[PDB]
Design a protein around this ligand. Structure first.
Ligand SMILES: CC(C)[C@H](C(=O)O)[C@@H](O)C(=O)O
Ligand SMILES: CC(C)[C@H](C(=O)O)[C@@H](O)C(=O)O
Ligand SMILES: [Mg+2]
Ligand SMILES: [Mg+2]
Lengths: 357, 357
């Protein structure tokens, strides 16, 4: 029996999770996984009920689970709150608390959604990239950090740090991912300015000896920002830190064109959290407009990386393709004047497209 | 009388500065500017001569000058050199030595060079962005930093840091730049995760009160990486830090399509350095192939920002446009099967296109 902790969150979080839960419950019944799901509050929903973005109870729930599903966190409703109590702090505490250091963000375009891409057609025709971003270390969690007043002058500071063990584990994930893809890994750094990232380059080069079958390349983060646009098809697996991964992942996501179709996995030792990478989009919250396909595709990642159900992870991914083939579109992926369906209907549509006996 | 310190550097640097020199000399003579130019060593050229990327002599020449011109620094030739002596250290030490805190990198696309752009023509057609990047602070120059061993494990660290004065001065340049443009300023940070960048947002918000004519908006760095390609025309002046500015400016450069056309200005109090932003292109170094136009346009920025020769800055800029209308193209900006001219010829073409006598 597998325990799944659910943290819908803020904005469109609740509705996109409900839609994806339809699909999840469907696969569970068909496959007989015997999953037990529990719901906990996170982000702004948690602040509203407990004045804390990740209550202790919510944290223990996640710790006690095998897989974690999160909808979204964030919204201007909580700006009046202190920085340490902001909605995304709960997300950061989940990642850090569960030590989910391997963030996997696959970037590819659905053939029926190619026109949504900002780049010229011929460039992004075959963009299939996997950003493997380190999630629990770096400047994000480095100490010391903070704001201070030195001689009447405000000074802000943050510490970027990584030790050889943190770099080695994320590298193994990226190298193993490359082997199961096109055998190409690009480690991104700023080794000629930032010493932390030079150690990053050195340790990845050492681990590269363990994967003679993969072609390793190093690239500076600024140059990588140009290459993603200039020739995206050159990338297979892109490895980088927390900070650089945050930026380059969003860049990779935009060039696919449809952010509401992009899933993600955050893996650690014996745990994992799955969430869409599109945010809480507050302005459409509760309007049944949100695209749940990214959350649904994240469930497919969970079936694969956490529930030992590859055949079913594929069937979920196939149903999503099927829904698109049959012309079903949510507002974000539909052309002007073209028919559009809501969050609820899109969920029930994938369940049907599952062609369950 | 004004002094100009010239540092050609490595790779294509010597040839692109010579072409640019043809233009500077043509303008100096015609305008009667009375400029005193001196040449120094920087980067690998300085290493080969002094085993130091920025010898004390080079620093004093630059410190004595009114304006500095730099071609390019870097190359695999100096990989055998210790991290502290790599060619790029000379560049950083110049920016820091002369306290050139305001980096200006205008991202515009030339009408006849629109086909080089990677974005869908309708998006890029009207791109007119100016990236104002803080150049002397941030994690780039933050202390402490280094590589150590704790309990037998390697640890890499760097310090990101900014005080209110550092932010106030770069904010002023950006707000002022925006006034003379579309009066729209976008400040990029990661205020929800990094405290240094939250102070950045706060101080910028403070200085914004001095510029009621310019509209200020804040955006997270990851979102900016998306917004640049999704809808580049939304940006006028984009203000951000050293590291973020490093990544975002390169992304903005790529969407214009032709990196060989982009100029830059690093301004400080009474000092200024001008360099292109394409790198040393070691592979074509010394083949008279390099596009000298970015450097020429950098000289144009110098006429405007240092030599107080705005009308002559415009004429150089007008001459570069004329050359393109004439259909003159170096390899990098030439369509396949189109006539291609060398570095030297392209420089002469601009001087001729100045229509002097
Ligand atoms: C919301 C924020 C704290 C988070 C991050 O910076 O990692 C987000 O931008 C992401 O990439 O998932
Ligand atoms: C070479 C490097 C130190 C420098 C920087 O990172 O600022 C360069 O990439 C640039 O953009 O001028
Ligand atoms: Mg992000
Ligand atoms: Mg750069």
């Amino acid at each position: 029996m597998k325990k799944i902790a659910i943290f819908a969150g803020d904005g469109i979080g609740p509705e996109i999770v409900a839609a994806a839960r339809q699909v999840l419950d469907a696969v569970d019944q068909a496959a007989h996984l015997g999953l037990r799901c529990t719901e906990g509050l996170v982000g702004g929903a948690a602040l509203d009920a407990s004045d804390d973005p990740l209550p202790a109870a919510s944290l223990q729930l996640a710790m006690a689970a095998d897989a974690v599903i999160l909808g979204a966190v964030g919204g201007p409703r909580w700006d009046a709150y202190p920085p340490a109590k902001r909605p995304e702090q709960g997300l950061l505490r989940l990642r850090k608390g569960l030590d989910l250091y391997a963030n996997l963000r696959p970037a590819q375009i659905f053939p029926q959604l190619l026109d949504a891409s900002p780049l010229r057609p011929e460039l992004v025709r075959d963009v299939d990239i996997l950003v493997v971003r380190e999630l629990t270390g770096d400047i994000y969690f480095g100490q010391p950090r903070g704001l201070e007043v030195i001689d009447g002058k405000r000074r802000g500071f943050n510490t970027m740090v990584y030790d050889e063990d943190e770099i080695r584990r994320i590298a193994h994930v990226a190298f193993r991912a490359a082997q199961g893809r096109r055998k190409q890994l690009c480690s991104v750094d700023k080794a000629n300015v930032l010493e932390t990232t030079r150690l990053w380059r050195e340790v990845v080069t050492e681990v590269a000896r363990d994967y003679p079958d993969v072609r390793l390349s190093h690239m500076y983060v600024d140059n990588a920002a140009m290459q993603l646009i200039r020739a995206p098809a050159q990338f297979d697996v892109l490895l980088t830190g927390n900070m650089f991964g945050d930026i380059l992942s969003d860049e990779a996501s935009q060039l696919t064109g449809s952010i509401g179709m992009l899933p993600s996995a955050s893996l650690g030792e014996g745990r994992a959290m799955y969430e869409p990478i599109h945010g809480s989009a507050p302005d459409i919250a509760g309007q049944d407009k949100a695209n749940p396909l990214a959350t649904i595709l994240s469930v497919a990642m969970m079936l694969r990386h956490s529930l030992n159900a590859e055949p079913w992870a594929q069937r979920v991914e196939a149903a999503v393709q099927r829904v698109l083939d049959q012309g079903l579109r949510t507002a974000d992926i539909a052309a002007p004047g073209t028919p559009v369906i809501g969050t609820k209907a899109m969920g029930a549509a994938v369940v049907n497209a599952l062609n369950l006996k």
